[PDB]
Coordinates of C-alpha atoms and ligand atoms in Angstrom, one line a residue:
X1 CA 44.6 67.7 -43.3
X2 CA 45.7 64.1 -42.6
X3 CA 47.0 62.4 -39.5
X4 CA 50.7 62.9 -38.9
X5 CA 52.4 59.5 -39.6
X6 CA 54.6 57.6 -37.1
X7 CA 56.7 54.6 -38.4
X8 CA 58.3 52.4 -35.7
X9 CA 60.4 49.3 -36.3
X10 CA 62.1 46.5 -34.2
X11 CA 65.1 44.7 -35.7
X12 CA 64.3 41.6 -37.8
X13 CA 64.9 38.5 -35.6
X14 CA 67.3 35.7 -36.5
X15 CA 65.3 32.4 -36.1
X16 CA 67.8 30.2 -34.2
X17 CA 65.0 28.8 -32.0
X18 CA 65.6 30.2 -28.5
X19 CA 63.4 33.3 -28.0
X20 CA 63.9 34.6 -24.4
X21 CA 62.5 37.7 -22.6
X22 CA 65.4 39.8 -24.0
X23 CA 63.9 39.4 -27.6
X24 CA 60.3 39.9 -26.2
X25 CA 61.4 43.2 -24.7
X26 CA 62.1 44.9 -28.1
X27 CA 58.7 43.9 -29.6
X28 CA 56.8 44.7 -26.3
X29 CA 58.5 48.1 -26.0
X30 CA 57.9 48.8 -29.7
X31 CA 54.2 47.8 -29.1
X32 CA 53.9 50.3 -26.2
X33 CA 55.3 53.2 -28.3
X34 CA 52.9 52.1 -31.2
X35 CA 49.8 51.9 -28.9
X36 CA 50.8 55.3 -27.2
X37 CA 51.2 57.0 -30.6
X38 CA 47.9 55.6 -31.9
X39 CA 46.2 57.0 -28.7
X40 CA 47.9 60.4 -29.5
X41 CA 46.2 60.4 -32.9
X42 CA 49.1 59.4 -35.2
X43 CA 48.8 57.2 -38.3
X44 CA 51.1 54.5 -37.0
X45 CA 52.9 51.7 -38.8
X46 CA 54.8 49.2 -36.6
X47 CA 57.1 46.6 -38.3
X48 CA 58.9 43.5 -37.1
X49 CA 60.2 40.5 -39.1
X50 CA 62.9 37.8 -39.5
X51 CA 66.4 37.5 -41.0
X52 CA 66.0 34.2 -42.9
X53 CA 69.3 34.0 -44.9
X54 CA 72.9 32.9 -44.3
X55 CA 74.9 29.6 -44.3
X56 CA 73.8 28.7 -40.7
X57 CA 70.0 28.7 -41.5
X58 CA 70.5 26.4 -44.5
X59 CA 72.9 24.1 -42.4
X60 CA 70.2 23.9 -39.7
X61 CA 67.4 23.1 -42.2
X62 CA 69.5 20.4 -43.9
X63 CA 70.6 18.9 -40.5
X64 CA 66.9 18.6 -39.5
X65 CA 66.1 16.8 -42.9
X66 CA 63.9 19.8 -44.1
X67 CA 64.1 22.3 -47.0
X68 CA 65.1 25.9 -46.1
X69 CA 61.5 27.1 -46.6
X70 CA 60.0 24.1 -44.5
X71 CA 62.4 24.9 -41.6
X72 CA 61.8 28.7 -41.8
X73 CA 58.0 28.4 -42.1
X74 CA 58.0 26.3 -38.8
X75 CA 60.3 28.8 -37.0
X76 CA 58.4 31.9 -38.2
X77 CA 55.1 30.2 -37.2
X78 CA 56.4 29.9 -33.6
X79 CA 57.7 33.6 -33.6
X80 CA 54.3 34.9 -34.9
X81 CA 52.4 32.8 -32.3
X82 CA 54.5 34.4 -29.5
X83 CA 53.8 37.9 -30.9
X84 CA 50.1 37.1 -31.1
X85 CA 50.3 35.8 -27.5
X86 CA 52.0 39.0 -26.3
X87 CA 49.3 41.0 -28.2
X88 CA 52.0 42.8 -30.4
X89 CA 50.1 45.4 -32.6
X90 CA 52.6 45.1 -35.5
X91 CA 50.9 46.2 -38.8
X92 CA 53.2 43.9 -40.9
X93 CA 55.8 41.1 -40.6
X94 CA 58.7 41.3 -43.1
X95 CA 60.4 38.0 -44.1
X96 CA 63.7 38.3 -46.1
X97 CA 62.6 35.3 -48.2
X98 CA 59.7 37.4 -49.7
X99 CA 60.2 38.8 -53.3
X100 CA 59.3 42.3 -52.0
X101 CA 62.5 42.1 -49.9
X102 CA 64.8 40.2 -52.4
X103 CA 63.9 42.7 -55.2
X104 CA 65.1 45.7 -53.0
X105 CA 68.3 43.9 -51.9
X106 CA 69.2 43.2 -55.6
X107 CA 68.3 46.7 -56.9
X108 CA 70.1 48.5 -54.0
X109 CA 73.2 46.3 -54.6
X110 CA 73.1 46.9 -58.4
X111 CA 72.6 50.7 -57.9
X112 CA 75.6 51.0 -55.6
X113 CA 77.7 48.9 -58.1
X114 CA 76.7 51.3 -61.0
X115 CA 77.4 54.4 -58.8
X116 CA 80.8 52.9 -57.9
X117 CA 80.1 52.9 -54.1
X118 CA 80.6 49.1 -54.2
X119 CA 83.8 47.5 -55.8
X120 CA 85.2 44.0 -56.0
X121 CA 88.0 42.9 -53.7
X122 CA 89.1 40.1 -51.4
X123 CA 87.6 39.7 -47.8
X124 CA 90.2 38.6 -45.2
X125 CA 88.8 37.5 -41.8
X126 CA 89.9 35.6 -38.7
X127 CA 87.5 32.7 -38.0
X128 CA 87.2 30.5 -34.9
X129 CA 85.7 27.1 -36.0
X130 CA 84.6 26.1 -32.4
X131 CA 82.7 29.5 -31.9
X132 CA 81.8 29.9 -35.7
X133 CA 82.4 33.7 -35.3
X134 CA 84.8 35.9 -37.5
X135 CA 87.0 38.6 -36.0
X136 CA 89.3 41.5 -37.2
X137 CA 93.2 41.4 -36.6
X138 CA 92.5 44.2 -34.1
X139 CA 90.6 42.0 -31.6
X140 CA 92.7 38.7 -31.6
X141 CA 94.2 37.9 -28.2
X142 CA 98.0 37.0 -28.0
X143 CA 98.3 37.9 -31.7
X144 CA 101.4 36.4 -33.5
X145 CA 103.3 38.5 -36.0
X146 CA 105.7 38.1 -39.0
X147 CA 107.3 41.1 -40.7
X148 CA 104.9 43.4 -38.8
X149 CA 101.7 41.6 -40.1
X150 CA 99.3 39.8 -37.7
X151 CA 99.8 36.0 -38.7
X152 CA 97.1 34.6 -36.3
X153 CA 95.9 34.6 -32.7
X154 CA 93.4 33.3 -30.1
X155 CA 89.6 33.9 -30.2
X156 CA 88.6 36.7 -27.6
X157 CA 85.9 34.2 -26.3
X158 CA 86.6 30.4 -26.7
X159 CA 90.5 31.0 -26.5
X160 CA 90.9 28.5 -29.5
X161 CA 93.4 29.5 -32.3
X162 CA 91.6 31.3 -35.2
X163 CA 92.0 30.5 -38.9
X164 CA 92.7 33.1 -41.6
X165 CA 89.8 33.0 -44.1
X166 CA 89.9 34.6 -47.6
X167 CA 87.2 34.9 -50.3
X168 CA 86.3 37.2 -53.2
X169 CA 83.9 39.9 -51.8
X170 CA 82.3 43.2 -52.9
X171 CA 83.2 46.2 -50.6
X172 CA 81.1 49.3 -49.8
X173 CA 83.4 52.3 -49.4
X174 CA 81.6 54.0 -46.5
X175 CA 84.6 56.2 -45.4
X176 CA 83.8 59.0 -48.0
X177 CA 80.4 59.7 -46.2
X178 CA 82.2 60.3 -42.9
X179 CA 82.0 64.1 -42.9
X180 CA 78.3 64.0 -44.0
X181 CA 77.5 61.5 -41.2
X182 CA 79.2 63.8 -38.5
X183 CA 77.3 66.8 -40.0
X184 CA 74.0 64.7 -39.7
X185 CA 74.7 64.1 -36.0
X186 CA 75.4 67.9 -35.5
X187 CA 72.1 68.9 -37.2
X188 CA 70.1 66.0 -35.4
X189 CA 71.4 66.0 -31.8
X190 CA 68.6 63.6 -30.6
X191 CA 69.2 61.0 -33.4
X192 CA 71.0 58.5 -31.0
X193 CA 69.1 57.5 -27.8
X194 CA 70.5 57.1 -25.2
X195 CA 72.6 60.3 -26.1
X196 CA 75.8 58.9 -24.3
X197 CA 76.1 56.3 -27.1
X198 CA 76.8 59.0 -29.8
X199 CA 80.4 60.1 -28.5
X200 CA 81.2 56.3 -27.8
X201 CA 80.4 55.6 -31.6
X202 CA 82.5 58.6 -32.8
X203 CA 85.4 57.7 -30.5
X204 CA 85.4 53.9 -31.0
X205 CA 84.4 53.6 -34.7
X206 CA 84.3 56.9 -36.8
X207 CA 87.4 58.7 -35.3
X208 CA 89.8 55.8 -36.2
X209 CA 88.5 55.6 -39.8
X210 CA 85.6 53.6 -41.2
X211 CA 86.9 50.4 -42.9
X212 CA 85.4 49.4 -46.3
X213 CA 82.4 47.1 -45.5
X214 CA 82.5 43.5 -47.1
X215 CA 78.8 43.4 -48.3
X216 CA 79.0 40.1 -50.3
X217 CA 80.4 36.6 -49.9
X218 CA 81.1 33.7 -52.5
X219 CA 81.4 31.0 -49.8
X220 CA 77.7 30.2 -49.4
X221 CA 74.5 30.1 -51.5
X222 CA 71.4 30.6 -49.2
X223 CA 70.7 34.3 -49.7
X224 CA 70.1 37.1 -52.3
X225 CA 72.5 36.7 -55.3
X226 CA 74.1 39.7 -57.0
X227 CA 72.3 39.9 -60.4
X228 CA 75.5 41.1 -62.3
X229 CA 77.8 38.6 -60.5
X230 CA 75.6 35.6 -59.4
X231 CA 78.4 33.6 -57.6
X232 CA 78.3 36.5 -55.0
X233 CA 75.5 36.3 -52.3
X234 CA 74.6 39.6 -50.5
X235 CA 75.9 39.5 -46.8
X236 CA 73.7 40.5 -43.8
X237 CA 74.6 44.3 -43.8
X238 CA 72.5 45.3 -46.9
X239 CA 70.1 42.3 -46.8
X240 CA 68.9 42.9 -43.2
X241 CA 69.1 46.8 -43.1
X242 CA 66.8 47.3 -46.2
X243 CA 64.0 45.3 -44.5
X244 CA 62.9 48.7 -43.1
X245 CA 62.1 50.1 -46.7
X246 CA 61.4 46.8 -48.5
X247 CA 58.4 46.3 -46.1
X248 CA 57.0 49.6 -47.4
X249 CA 57.1 48.3 -51.0
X250 CA 60.2 50.5 -51.9
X251 CA 61.0 49.9 -55.7
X252 CA 57.8 47.7 -56.1
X253 CA 54.8 48.2 -58.4
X254 CA 53.1 50.2 -55.6
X255 CA 55.4 52.5 -53.4
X256 CA 52.4 54.2 -51.6
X257 CA 53.4 52.8 -48.1
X258 CA 57.0 54.0 -48.7
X259 CA 55.8 57.5 -49.8
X260 CA 53.5 57.7 -46.7
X261 CA 55.8 56.3 -43.9
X262 CA 59.5 56.7 -44.9
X263 CA 61.5 58.0 -43.1
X264 CA 61.2 55.9 -39.9
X265 CA 60.4 58.0 -36.7
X266 CA 62.2 55.4 -34.5
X267 CA 64.3 52.2 -35.0
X268 CA 64.2 50.3 -31.7
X269 CA 67.0 47.7 -31.0
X270 CA 69.2 46.1 -28.4
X271 CA 72.5 48.1 -27.7
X272 CA 74.8 45.6 -29.4
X273 CA 73.6 46.5 -32.9
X274 CA 73.1 50.3 -32.5
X275 CA 76.5 51.0 -34.2
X276 CA 75.1 49.4 -37.4
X277 CA 71.9 51.5 -37.3
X278 CA 73.9 54.7 -36.3
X279 CA 76.7 54.5 -39.0
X280 CA 76.1 51.9 -41.8
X281 CA 72.3 52.5 -42.2
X282 CA 72.6 56.3 -42.5
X283 CA 75.5 56.0 -45.0
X284 CA 73.6 53.4 -47.1
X285 CA 70.6 55.8 -47.2
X286 CA 72.9 58.7 -48.3
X287 CA 74.3 56.4 -51.1
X288 CA 70.6 55.8 -52.2
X289 CA 69.8 59.5 -51.8
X290 CA 67.0 58.6 -49.3
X291 CA 65.9 60.6 -46.2
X292 CA 67.5 59.3 -42.9
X293 CA 65.6 57.9 -39.9
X294 CA 64.7 60.5 -37.3
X295 CA 65.9 58.4 -34.2
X296 CA 67.6 55.2 -33.2
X297 CA 66.9 53.8 -29.7
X298 CA 69.1 51.2 -28.1
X299 CA 67.7 49.5 -24.9
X300 CA 69.8 47.4 -22.4
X301 CA 69.7 43.6 -21.7
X302 CA 67.6 41.6 -19.2
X303 CA 70.3 39.7 -17.3
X304 CA 70.2 36.8 -14.8
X305 CA 72.8 36.2 -11.9
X306 CA 74.8 34.0 -14.3
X307 CA 75.2 36.8 -16.9
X308 CA 73.5 37.1 -20.4
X309 CA 70.8 34.4 -20.7
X310 CA 71.8 31.8 -23.4
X311 CA 70.8 28.1 -24.2
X312 CA 74.4 27.1 -23.6
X313 CA 74.2 28.1 -19.8
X314 CA 70.6 26.9 -19.4
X315 CA 69.9 30.5 -18.3
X316 CA 67.0 31.2 -20.7
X317 CA 63.7 32.6 -19.4
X318 CA 60.8 31.6 -21.7
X319 CA 58.1 34.3 -22.2
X320 CA 55.6 31.5 -23.1
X321 CA 56.1 30.1 -19.5
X322 CA 55.7 33.6 -17.9
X323 CA 52.4 34.3 -19.8
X324 CA 50.9 30.8 -19.2
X325 CA 51.9 30.9 -15.4
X326 CA 51.2 34.6 -14.5
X327 CA 49.3 36.1 -17.4
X328 CA 50.0 38.6 -20.2
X329 CA 49.5 41.9 -18.2
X330 CA 52.1 40.7 -15.5
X331 CA 54.6 39.7 -18.2
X332 CA 54.4 43.0 -20.3
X333 CA 54.3 45.1 -17.0
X334 CA 57.5 43.3 -15.6
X335 CA 59.4 43.8 -18.9
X336 CA 58.5 47.6 -19.2
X337 CA 58.9 48.4 -15.5
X338 CA 62.3 46.7 -14.8
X339 CA 64.4 47.8 -17.8
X340 CA 65.4 51.5 -17.2
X341 CA 66.6 53.9 -20.0
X342 CA 70.4 53.7 -20.6
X343 CA 70.8 50.7 -18.2
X344 CA 70.5 46.9 -18.1
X345 CA 67.8 45.0 -16.0
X346 CA 67.9 41.9 -13.9
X347 CA 65.3 39.1 -13.9
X348 CA 64.7 36.9 -10.8
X349 CA 61.5 34.9 -10.2
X350 CA 61.2 36.6 -6.7
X351 CA 61.4 40.1 -8.3
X352 CA 58.8 39.0 -11.0
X353 CA 56.3 37.8 -8.3
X354 CA 56.8 41.0 -6.2
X355 CA 56.1 43.2 -9.2
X356 CA 53.0 41.1 -10.3
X357 CA 51.6 40.7 -6.8
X358 CA 52.4 44.1 -5.1
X359 CA 52.0 46.5 -8.0
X360 CA 49.2 44.9 -10.1
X361 CA 47.2 42.5 -7.9
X362 CA 47.5 44.5 -4.6
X363 CA 47.9 48.3 -5.4
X364 CA 45.8 48.5 -8.6
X365 CA 43.6 45.3 -8.3
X366 CA 42.5 46.0 -4.7
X367 CA 42.0 49.8 -5.3
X368 CA 39.3 48.8 -8.0
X369 CA 37.8 46.1 -5.8
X370 CA 37.7 48.3 -2.6
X371 CA 36.0 51.2 -4.6
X372 CA 33.4 49.0 -6.4
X373 CA 32.6 47.2 -3.1
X374 CA 32.0 50.6 -1.3
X375 CA 29.8 51.9 -4.2
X376 CA 27.6 48.7 -4.1
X377 CA 27.4 48.8 -0.3
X378 CA 26.7 52.5 0.3
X379 CA 24.7 53.5 -2.9
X380 CA 23.4 50.2 -4.2
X381 CA 25.9 50.3 -7.1
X382 CA 24.9 53.8 -8.3
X383 CA 28.0 56.0 -8.4
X384 CA 27.0 59.7 -7.6
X385 CA 27.9 62.1 -10.4
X386 CA 31.1 64.2 -9.9
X387 CA 30.3 67.7 -8.7
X388 CA 33.7 69.3 -7.7
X389 CA 36.6 69.2 -5.2
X390 CA 34.2 69.1 -2.1
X391 CA 36.7 67.4 0.4
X392 CA 39.7 69.4 1.7
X393 CA 42.1 66.8 0.1
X394 CA 40.4 67.1 -3.4
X395 CA 42.1 70.4 -4.7
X396 CA 45.6 68.9 -4.3
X397 CA 44.6 65.4 -5.5
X398 CA 42.9 66.7 -8.6
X399 CA 46.1 68.8 -9.3
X400 CA 48.2 65.6 -8.7
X401 CA 46.0 63.7 -11.3
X402 CA 46.9 66.4 -14.0
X403 CA 50.6 66.5 -12.8
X404 CA 50.6 62.7 -13.2
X405 CA 49.4 62.9 -16.9
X406 CA 52.0 65.7 -17.6
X407 CA 54.9 63.8 -16.0
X408 CA 53.8 60.5 -17.7
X409 CA 53.8 62.4 -21.1
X410 CA 57.3 63.8 -20.8
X411 CA 58.6 60.3 -19.6
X412 CA 56.9 58.5 -22.6
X413 CA 58.2 61.1 -25.2
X414 CA 61.7 60.7 -23.7
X415 CA 61.4 56.8 -23.9
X416 CA 61.6 56.5 -20.0
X417 CA 58.9 53.8 -19.8
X418 CA 59.9 52.5 -16.3
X419 CA 59.6 56.2 -14.9
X420 CA 56.2 56.6 -16.7
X421 CA 55.0 53.4 -14.9
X422 CA 56.4 54.5 -11.5
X423 CA 54.8 57.9 -11.8
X424 CA 51.4 56.2 -12.5
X425 CA 51.9 53.9 -9.5
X426 CA 52.6 57.0 -7.2
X427 CA 49.0 58.1 -8.2
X428 CA 47.5 54.6 -7.6
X429 CA 49.2 54.5 -4.1
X430 CA 47.9 58.0 -3.3
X431 CA 44.3 56.9 -4.4
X432 CA 44.5 53.9 -1.9
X433 CA 45.8 56.5 0.7
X434 CA 42.7 58.7 -0.1
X435 CA 40.5 55.8 1.1
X436 CA 42.4 55.6 4.4
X437 CA 42.4 59.4 4.8
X438 CA 38.6 59.9 4.1
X439 CA 37.4 56.7 5.9
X440 CA 34.2 56.3 3.8
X441 CA 32.7 53.9 6.3
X442 CA 32.8 56.7 9.0
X443 CA 30.9 59.1 6.5
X444 CA 28.3 56.4 5.8
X445 CA 27.2 56.5 9.5
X446 CA 26.0 60.2 9.5
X447 CA 23.1 61.1 7.1
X448 CA 24.5 64.7 7.0
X449 CA 27.6 63.5 5.1
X450 CA 25.9 61.6 2.2
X451 CA 27.0 64.3 -0.4
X452 CA 30.6 64.1 1.0
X453 CA 30.5 60.3 0.8
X454 CA 29.3 60.6 -2.9
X455 CA 32.2 63.1 -3.6
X456 CA 34.8 60.6 -2.2
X457 CA 33.5 57.7 -4.4
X458 CA 33.5 60.0 -7.4
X459 CA 37.2 61.0 -6.8
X460 CA 38.1 57.2 -6.3
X461 CA 36.5 56.3 -9.7
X462 CA 37.9 59.4 -11.5
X463 CA 41.5 58.5 -10.1
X464 CA 40.9 54.9 -11.3
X465 CA 39.8 56.1 -14.8
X466 CA 43.0 58.3 -15.1
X467 CA 45.2 55.3 -14.2
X468 CA 43.3 52.9 -16.6
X469 CA 43.7 55.3 -19.6
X470 CA 47.5 55.9 -18.9
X471 CA 48.1 52.1 -18.7
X472 CA 46.3 51.3 -22.1
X473 CA 49.6 51.2 -24.0
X474 CA 51.3 48.9 -21.4
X475 CA 48.4 46.5 -20.3
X476 CA 46.0 45.1 -23.0
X477 CA 43.5 43.4 -20.5
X478 CA 43.4 45.3 -17.2
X479 CA 42.2 48.7 -18.5
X480 CA 39.3 47.1 -20.6
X481 CA 38.3 45.0 -17.5
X482 CA 38.4 48.2 -15.2
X483 CA 36.2 50.2 -17.7
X484 CA 33.8 47.1 -18.0
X485 CA 33.4 46.7 -14.1
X486 CA 33.0 50.5 -13.7
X487 CA 30.5 50.4 -16.6
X488 CA 32.3 53.3 -18.3
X489 CA 31.0 52.4 -21.9
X490 CA 31.7 55.7 -23.8
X491 CA 34.9 55.2 -25.9
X492 CA 35.7 59.0 -25.5
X493 CA 36.2 58.4 -21.7
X494 CA 39.0 55.9 -22.5
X495 CA 41.2 58.4 -24.5
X496 CA 44.0 60.9 -23.6
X497 CA 41.7 63.9 -24.5
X498 CA 39.3 63.0 -21.6
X499 CA 42.2 63.6 -19.0
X500 CA 42.5 67.3 -19.9
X501 CA 39.9 68.3 -17.2
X502 CA 39.3 66.2 -14.0
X503 CA 35.8 64.8 -13.4
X504 CA 34.1 63.8 -16.7
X505 CA 31.5 61.6 -15.0
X506 CA 28.8 64.3 -14.3
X507 CA 26.0 61.7 -14.7
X508 CA 25.3 58.8 -12.2
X509 CA 26.6 55.4 -13.4
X510 CA 25.6 51.8 -12.2
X511 CA 28.8 49.8 -11.5
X512 CA 28.9 45.9 -11.7
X513 CA 27.0 44.1 -8.9
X514 CA 29.6 41.3 -9.1
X515 CA 33.1 42.7 -9.1
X516 CA 35.9 40.2 -9.8
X517 CA 39.7 40.3 -9.6
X518 CA 41.2 42.5 -12.4
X519 CA 44.3 40.2 -12.2
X520 CA 45.4 37.6 -13.2
Ligands
1V7_601 C1 76.8 30.1 -34.9 N1 76.4 31.4 -35.5 C2 75.3 32.0 -35.1 O1 74.7 31.7 -34.1 C3 74.8 33.1 -36.0 C4 74.3 34.3 -35.5 C5 73.9 35.4 -36.3 C6 73.9 35.2 -37.7 C7 74.3 33.9 -38.2 C8 74.8 32.9 -37.4 N2 74.2 34.0 -39.6 C9 73.8 35.2 -39.9 C10 73.6 35.7 -41.2 C11 74.7 35.6 -42.1 C12 74.5 35.9 -43.5 C13 73.3 36.4 -43.9 BR1 73.1 37.0 -45.7 C14 72.2 36.5 -43.0 O2 71.0 37.0 -43.4 C15 72.4 36.2 -41.7 N3 73.5 36.0 -38.7 C16 73.1 37.3 -38.7 C17 71.8 37.5 -37.8 N4 71.0 38.7 -38.2 C18 70.7 39.6 -37.3 O3 71.0 39.6 -36.1 C19 69.8 40.8 -37.8 O4 70.4 42.0 -37.5 C20 69.8 43.2 -38.0 C21 68.5 43.3 -38.0 C22 67.9 44.5 -38.6 C23 68.8 45.4 -39.2 C24 70.1 45.2 -39.2 C25 70.7 44.1 -38.6 C26 72.3 43.9 -38.6 C27 72.7 42.6 -39.2 C28 73.0 45.1 -39.3 C29 72.7 43.9 -37.1 C30 74.3 38.3 -38.3 C31 75.4 38.1 -39.0 C32 76.6 38.8 -38.7 C33 76.5 39.7 -37.7 O5 77.6 40.4 -37.2 C34 78.9 40.1 -37.8 C35 75.3 39.9 -37.0 O6 75.4 40.8 -36.0 C36 74.3 40.9 -35.0 C37 74.2 39.2 -37.3

């Protein structure tokens, strides 16, 4: 009786200032899924947010001569400005400084304490002061021993000697849920995407035994405090992970969003945090007796020919610069086209320009401009109504249009965005080829071939309309501009349902008398 719901999330971003195209990819990709699911008729909720706690945030605020909230408000303003600039269709933005989040972190922690899933112990970690990163005994390089116990070592990055750090900490005993998690994987084979990551998780993390998780610290203050032991602050594991249910008003005075949208249909994230969403998150939800998420999707990185982009190498590509210089459509298209499923992508300015110029401006932009120009020149702007596949090429081309939609659909549902886009561009290329094959200018000579000329123009515009509709989730400007210039005004003709049967324009239409570039 009601629309089926679809809840999609990106990870909450840690506001350390440097937002590169790698961070933009997650929110753009999430936006594409969100827009696609809305067009399919789902009741969609798309969430993003920020991780605002931890020692480092408060150190950075204090160093800058600001309060924690002053500092964070400025950083979050910048992040939300970028999302608005990328036209991210997120329905909400969760900040971990909000009471709706803090209340959940406190209540979840207290519940696990009362159930006995969390117990007090002592955290022991290997810390590198230069790198400010902790490690387990297992990953120290050139470890030193004494009586069989690891006594120290070298950071597996910097190469500086690590320091043994100890502090009182609450532990979450996750190992007892091991069997339940493996059974969950068995009954939900599509849970982890790409599917190759599942056995890597099992082998590297679950098979060797899940260590108790240190979920609190006593060494810093900026964060959620444990109500029944206020010297303890909740660490990132529970604090960050419950953002996905705290955003829905879980345990608030109004849980209606939580009742409607939980569980999440897809958690989208970069591959380096999929182990936390694949193991810790499901086990935490089991401990709270909540339904698990249906799917976790890990995407690859957008590299340079220096390696991972970072502020430290001066490697960072700024999405603001790309948008200001080349436009939004070009930026979103490049991100979604160049990062294939289960692999990494590689950014170069030359590759960006080729995609932008060859695919968008040339293939799609000139197809629209050539078509509109021919309709203005041969029929004074009045596009003859579609009649049927009159030309010998039409039967196979009309079939290709439907095969394009079908292929696009199975690519999108399998999260293969780059293949969906390449499939659409094969159709755009074929439409340009249709012009060369039919030579409209030759047909415009003979007065006998005026119906055949009208048929060709009708097939050009119907091919364009198919392309425009399929690109609606990816490009936020181009499709609107194409519909505008073609003077296709009817909202129904911009939806997926209007692609079921080829040739919906069975009435004459007057196209723009002043066509302009679709891009930039
Ligand atoms: C010099 N150091 C850094 O540049 C530095 C970099 C990251 C820092 C960080 C400092 N201090 C914090 C921090 C610490 C305490 C609290 Br409470 C908190 O709040 C955040 N973080 C956070 C940043 N937060 C994240 O990346 C958010 O991750 C998630 C998002 C959604 C859901 C789940 C997650 C998890 C955390 C499960 C991946 C952090 C701490 C430890 C981590 O692994 C050991 C980690 O893995 C990606 C992320």
